[PDB]
Amino acid sequence: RTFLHAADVVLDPDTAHPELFLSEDRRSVRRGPYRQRVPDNPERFDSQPCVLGRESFASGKHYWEVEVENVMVWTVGVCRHSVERKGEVLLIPQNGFWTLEMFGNQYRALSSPERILPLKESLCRVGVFLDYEAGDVSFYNMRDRSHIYTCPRSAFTVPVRPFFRLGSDDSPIFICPALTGASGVTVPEEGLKLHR
Amino acid sequence: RTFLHAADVVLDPDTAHPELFLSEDRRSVRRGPYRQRVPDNPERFDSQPCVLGRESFASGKHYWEVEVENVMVWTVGVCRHSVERKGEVLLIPQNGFWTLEMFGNQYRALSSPERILPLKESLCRVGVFLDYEAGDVSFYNMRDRSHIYTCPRSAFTVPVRPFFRLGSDDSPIFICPALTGASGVTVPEEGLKLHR
């Protein structure tokens, strides 16, 4: 009904700019040392170093969490599933992108230089919040679950997807899997202790 | 279903032991210096300093996060709606309690001295995860989202509720509200910034 979903987000290799290298579990990405031999399929970002989450939301409330520790240049947010991928695209609401980025050591709303977020501190884990019907894309510091930014209310119209950009060469972006408990694992007599 | 519910947990004042002091919003609680004049009612813990979440779960996957910073004696987890409220009840699976506790500077699963969890760090934010159909009650350290413990799988049989015990009169426990983005707040055309 009106439940918040803690979404499980896996990256889509068919959308990934060729400089982006996906982990084997597809839950993390790093900008690697060249341009992989990947087809220029129409869902692939060919210029902007971007990748989408595979999952798409068409209603209700969803959030997921992104680890960005030791990444200089990154973008997180939501996009229309059908946004333009090809050429020097503007990552702004008008083209169906709702984003937070780190650029020149600052936090910037809607990939804009006229929107600095004067955060007192460094973000390690970012929460990306979507209320589909409310037109709401919001961002959180998951250190203390403090609000960072809500994008201007937009009607989404079509399904939306998790959006990512990795500018820097420096460290991976990790998408935090949704908690699963012991799902699919043996729980012995004393319980399952410190699973990894 | 298949999706993880980020539950919004508010404490039920009718369950709360008389030495428990709830916040106005009922989203935090402390053990106070005296017994409050609260109606007797069958739902009230009368001997153990416990309180339940208002909402019960009969199906699906749910989780919520609890802040226990500077709380020396605490229990979090899940219990059957119908657990014994009156008298000294052992907080064990047999009596419908699935818990993690801090006790004598030690972490113990199932309120048992034979279930000591050898953690390297002091817990501050604890995730409580429920998979009703799987019989799964799991605990997470929400600093790094790392697994602490899954109880031996149990047939819940009846609806279950968030369970809390607060033994020490030092610090409140806080139940982290579900993220809501800009719900009930005007988003300016500039978008909403560091909401507090």
Author numbering:
A (entry chain B), B (entry chain A): 321 to 516
List sentences from the manuscript.
Vγ9Vδ2 T cells—a major subtype of human circulating γδ T cells—respond to multiple cancers and infectious diseases in an MHC-independent manner; they are specifically activated by small, non-peptidic diphosphate metabolites called pAgs. The sensing of pAgs in target cells requires a surface protein, BTN3A112–17, that has both intracellular and extracellular domains. Here we show how—in both humans and alpaca—multiple pAgs function as ‘molecular glues’ to promote heteromeric association between the intracellular domains of BTN3A1 and the structurally similar butyrophilin BTN2A1. The BTN3A1–pAg complex functions as a composite interface that directly binds to BTN2A1, bridged by the pAg molecule at the centre of the interface.
After introducing two gain-of-function mutations to the B30.2 domain of BTN2A2 (a BTN2A1 paralogue with 88.7% similarity), we observed efficient binding to BTN3A1 B30.2 in the presence of HMBPP. Notably, Vγ9Vδ2 T cell activation occurred only when the JM domain, transmembrane domain and ectodomain of BTN2A2 were replaced with their BTN2A1 counterparts.
